[PDB]
Amino acid sequence: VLLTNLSEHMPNDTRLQTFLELAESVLNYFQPFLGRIEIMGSAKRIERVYFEISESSRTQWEKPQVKESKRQFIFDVVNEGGEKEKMELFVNFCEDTIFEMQLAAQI
């Protein structure tokens, strides 16, 4: 996740870029595992910060019983709503999603 952030912050190299193609296979093993999001971390600009995806929890997410509620939620938010708390609605939506996956782990 370090060296990918080096790639992301610094593309347009050669010596890094040949090191970026040096030996990168577990790299490709590492892509259920790393999350890449895009925030503004009070930098008054974007921040592309990365982190780990617990793939066991992500498999716990991979079932439906939620994905249609997800798409339902999609229809809801594009349908109408106060247009700023729609992210807040997404927060609550996520919190309940957490509750769902938490309760469906023990199955």
Binding site: E38, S57, V78, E100
Partner: protein, 421 residues
């Protein structure tokens, strides 16, 4: 011995439980075509099918009971988790039961005027320290020891009592729970009688949703359709004055007069007659009435027929049909509108489908990577997982932003391609 061990199985197949539960109801209602009158049961087959009917009439019922069991596992407290989260954060930000004391309405909310004092208050939500936290938000202002006290085998009396009663009082106020409870009361009567007991088949209106396109294509527009009923009623309430004041000789439901010749010379009677006949007419009310062949008011009679022939038969038929087909076009346009707005520019930055595919094959990957909406949820799992002692400044930062319930950090118009050149 097996109690909570098998408990996961019930919600674990609860949807398939529901599917087979509705699957039984066909073969329930199927056999009643083989009826005969008194009530006779015909079996033109292997004659043990009637004892298997006697079996299945209660087998379906205990299936539905097991469906309510698996539901009582499944779509239970997550809803009251939401309700509890809601009321907790609203007393937190607001102190509604302390400072505001809401009105006679919100019976759902006023029900939670009785959960304020309850002991294991977020029994499945988060944490009870928020109670002491909002005591410190408000008790120094108004009452410190007052409002805190306002909050607060061998299983002999160690239970949540009134919290549990509040929980149930919320629990009763559910659509689908009451739907299935009503379905259980529907399935009761196999032990009682199959008068209405095979009539479970309403459940297709919530089983498959493919049909619900049609039902929604009705049900949003019905608020005018009841008014169509009303205007029908009043225009025939008009028409029943006319011949009642002017063509009672043209009333004749008589069997050719030599019988006790029948003419509705009461306003209500001819009204109900037009309702029964002239509504179901098709060919016009002049079909089922005295034709004129020389009357003084023959042309009045004819023009009355013509005005009926148009204004009922043409008009209101066309009204209901055109309502339905504009309802069709409305719902289809709405659906594909939603589809387009999903498939345009992003949800999160939401700038241009063209714009992040200015570079080819970008925008979909720009979605799948720069916005990838489930990953923000994953990130919240990541944050709520670990400890702030090990947060980075971004991590602790946005953690605190969420702690503030603020949400400013999301990208408005300012993606990474947008950030640079």
């Amino acid at each position: 011995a097996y109690q909570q061990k098998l408990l996961n199985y019930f919600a674990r197949n609860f949807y398939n439980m529901r599917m087979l539960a509705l699957f039984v109801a066909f073969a329930i209602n199927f056999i009643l075509l083989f009826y005969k009158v008194v009530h006779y049961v015909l079996e033109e087959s292997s004659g043990y099918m009637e004892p298997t009917l006697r079996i299945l009439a209660i087998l379906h019922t205990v299936i539905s009971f097991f469906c309510i069991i698996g539901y009582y596992c499944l779509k239970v407290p997550l809803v009251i988790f939401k309700r509890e989260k809601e009321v907790a954060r609203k007393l937190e930000f607001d102190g509604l039961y302390i400072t505001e004391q809401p009105s006679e309405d919100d019976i759902k909310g006023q029900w939670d005027r009785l959960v304020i004092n309850t002991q294991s208050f977020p029994n499945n939500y988060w944490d009870k320290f928020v109670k002491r936290k909002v005591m410190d938000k408000y008790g120094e202002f108004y009452g410190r020891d007052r409002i805190s006290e306002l909050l607060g085998s061998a299983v002999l009396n160690s239970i949540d009592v009134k919290y549990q009663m509040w929980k149930l009082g919320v629990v009763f106020t559910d659509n689908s729970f009451l739907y299935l409870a009503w379905y259980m009361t529907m399935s009761v009567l196999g032990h009682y009688n199959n008068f209405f007991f095979a009539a479970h088949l309403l459940d297709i209106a919530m089983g498959f949703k493919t049909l619900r396109t049609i039902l929604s294509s009705v049900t949003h527009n019905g608020k005018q359709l009841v008014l169509t009923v009303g205007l029908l009623a009043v225009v025939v309430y008009l028409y029943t004055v006319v011949a009642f004041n002017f063509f009672r000789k043209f009333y004749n439901k008589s069997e050719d007069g030599d019988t006790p010749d029948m003419k509705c010379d009461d306003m209500l009677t001819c009204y109900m007659f037009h309702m029964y006949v002239g509504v179901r007419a098709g060919g016009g009310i002049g079909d089922e009435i005295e034709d004129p062949a020389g009357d003084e008011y023959e042309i009045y009679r004819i023009i009355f027929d013509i005005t009926f022939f148009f204004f009922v038969i043409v008009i209101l038929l066309a009204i209901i049909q055109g309502l339905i087909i504009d309802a069709f076009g409305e719902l289809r346009d709405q659906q594909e509108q939603v589809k387009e707005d999903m498939e345009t520019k992003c949800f999160i930055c939401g700038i241009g489908n063209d714009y992040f595919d200015t570079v080819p094959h970008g925008f979909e990957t720009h979605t799948l990577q720069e916005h990838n909406l489930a990953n923000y949820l994953f990130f919240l799992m990541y944050l709520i997982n670990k400890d702030e002692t090990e947060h980075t400044g971004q991590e602790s930062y946005v953690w605190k932003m969420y702690q503030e319930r603020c949400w400013e950090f999301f990208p408005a118009g300012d993606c990474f391609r947008k950030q640079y050149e």
